[PDB]
Amino acid sequence: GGPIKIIDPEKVSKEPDALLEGFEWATLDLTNETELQELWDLLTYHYVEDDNAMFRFRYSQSFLHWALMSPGWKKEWHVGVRATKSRKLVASICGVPTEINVRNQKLKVVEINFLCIHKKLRSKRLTPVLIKEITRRCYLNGIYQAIYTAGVVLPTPVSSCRYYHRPLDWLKLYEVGFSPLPAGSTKARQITKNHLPSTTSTPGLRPMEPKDIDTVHDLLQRYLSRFALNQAFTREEVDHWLVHKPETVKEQVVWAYVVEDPETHKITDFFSFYNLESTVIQNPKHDNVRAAYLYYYATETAFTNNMKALKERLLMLMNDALILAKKAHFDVFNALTLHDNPLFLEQLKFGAGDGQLHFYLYNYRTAPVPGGVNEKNLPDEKRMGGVGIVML
Numbered sequence: 001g002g003p004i005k006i007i008d009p010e011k012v013s014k015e016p017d018a019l020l021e022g023f024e025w026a027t028l029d030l031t032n033e034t035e036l037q038e039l040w041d042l043l044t045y046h047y048v049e050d051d052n053a054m055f056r057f058r059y060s061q062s063f064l065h066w067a068l069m070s071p072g073w074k075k076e077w078h079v080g081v082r083a084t085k086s087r088k089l090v091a092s093i094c095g096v097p098t099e100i101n102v103r104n105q106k107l108k109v110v111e112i113n114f115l116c117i118h119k120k121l122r123s124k125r126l127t128p129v130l131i132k133e134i135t136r137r138c139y140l141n142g143i144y145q146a147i148y149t150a151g152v153v154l155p156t157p158v159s160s161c162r163y164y165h166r167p168l169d170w171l172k173l174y175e176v177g178f179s180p181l182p183a184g185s186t187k188a189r190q191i192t193k194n195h196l197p198s199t200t201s202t203p204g205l206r207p208m209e210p211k212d213i214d215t216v217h218d219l220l221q222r223y224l225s226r227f228a229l230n231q232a233f234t235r236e237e238v239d240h241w242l243v244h245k246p247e248t249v250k251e252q253v254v255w256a257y258v259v260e261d262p263e264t265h266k267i268t269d270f271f272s273f274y275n276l277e278s279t280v281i282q283n284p285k286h287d288n289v290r291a292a293y294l295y296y297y298a299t300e301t302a303f304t305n306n307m308k309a310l311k312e313r314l315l316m317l318m319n320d321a322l323i324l325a326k327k328a329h330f331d332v333f334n335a336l337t338l339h340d341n342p343l344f345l346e347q348l349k350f351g352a353g354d355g356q357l358h359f360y361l362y363n364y365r366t367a368p369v370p371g372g373v374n375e376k377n378l379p380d381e382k383r384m385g386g387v388g389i390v391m392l
């Protein structure tokens, strides 16, 4: 595979394309509290399909710092559009840089996300204008490839992964209309089905500490390198994305845990998940769903190439993840069919969700990579080894 087109950054326009009359380009300064608040307010009410949505996200300053101010981040890649007259921020699109491996070719990219347009400015084709502009700002700044996910069907997805959801408080998820009641099932039966143990099982499980950064970085690298398409974290990335900083982060976003071998004291596994809350719109019983999203993990057992051993170790580790998330008062535990997730999603009672998240690469062509599912969109242990990157 390889790039699709070569960019000459000296021929890249120094000025952005036209916007709809009455709007103007903005660069968001997320270090400025009022501008951070502007992005948050736009996302809170407008990062939603339309007025009919039953859920919106609840962002926090902590989440936005974690998502958008990762190592190498640039304010030029926090793109906004404002209404000229009111100054209101009406759209956004963001990138942060990272390195990925695409079938053994190292690639500097940006990960693009937080594309969002004010509900009242939809269907005006501002989206391609936002994409072309952040593209322009990346081209000017060293970067000619990007990686991103979307639910929308765009050409040539590099992979597609199915959504899965493990009920931690099933009743709440039923009451807000997310989890169905099967059959001749009953609420009590679904509550029993989802009941978790109160204590973890993996010997040596403990919260990750900053002293674990190096060994987690190394383990994660060796583990992800096994996947056709994967993220090549630096040490700084591990510190940013994986180590909660209670001094400086007001509302914890990442939960990370390691397994310190009881005999060797070497860390032999870790996993992590992040918190992104959903607002429940006008439900008289609940107004939020606390969702945990499975993030990165790794285990020394993978390197034996013994799939039965690996399944066994992941079943233990991920059930401990659920137990920890439940103890932490999360209501649901979300994951995709990427990594070795098909080894454990179904058995740990993750429910299959609707449709697929697609992964794309911009300006890079490679054979599609297996996304953890077969052609029937069912988790398949023969269709892993493909997607070794997750995105928030």
Ligand SMILES: CCCCCCCCCCCCCC(=O)SCCNC(=O)CCNC(=O)[C@H](O)C(C)(C)COP(=O)(O)OP(=O)(O)OC[C@H]1O[C@@H](n2cnc3c(N)ncnc32)[C@H](O)[C@@H]1OP(=O)(O)O
Binding pocket: 046, 047, 048, 049, 110, 112, 113, 114, 115, 116, 117, 118, 121, 122, 123, 124, 125, 126, 127, 128, 131, 134, 135, 138, 139, 143, 144, 145, 146, 148, 149, 150, 151, 152, 154, 362, 363
């Ligand atoms: C080298 C650097 C490269 C950097 C750039 C790399 C590429 C990055 C690409 C972006 C990756 C973003 C990753 C994420 O953030 S994915 C998350 C996307 N955001 C949301 O879901 C928030 C809620 N939704 C909205 O705000 C609106 O529905 C959005 C803004 C998404 C569409 O607003 P609207 O409904 O008003 O549409 P339009 O009239 O302006 O435009 C319609 C055109 O836009 C195409 N469209 C619609 N949805 C998406 C989508 N999710 N990815 C890519 N394209 C999309 C659509 O097919 C049509 O295409 P075409 O007619 O031109 O064929």
Ligand SMILES: Cc1c(COc2ccc(F)c(F)c2F)oc2cccc(OCCCNCc3cccnc3)c12
Binding pocket: 047, 055, 057, 113, 114, 162, 163, 164, 165, 173, 176, 178, 276, 278, 289, 291, 293, 332, 333, 334, 335, 336, 353, 391, 392
């Ligand atoms: C999103 C998402 C869902 C939906 O989760 C729930 C929504 C409402 C509920 F009541 C509920 F219980 C959920 F589990 O289930 C998933 C399973 C696997 C992965 C999922 O999303 C992966 C990417 C999440 N990016 C969220 C985001 C990113 C950037 C800006 N704003 C929001 C999801």
Ligand SMILES: [Cl-]
Binding pocket: 163, 353, 354
């Ligand atoms: Cl979903």
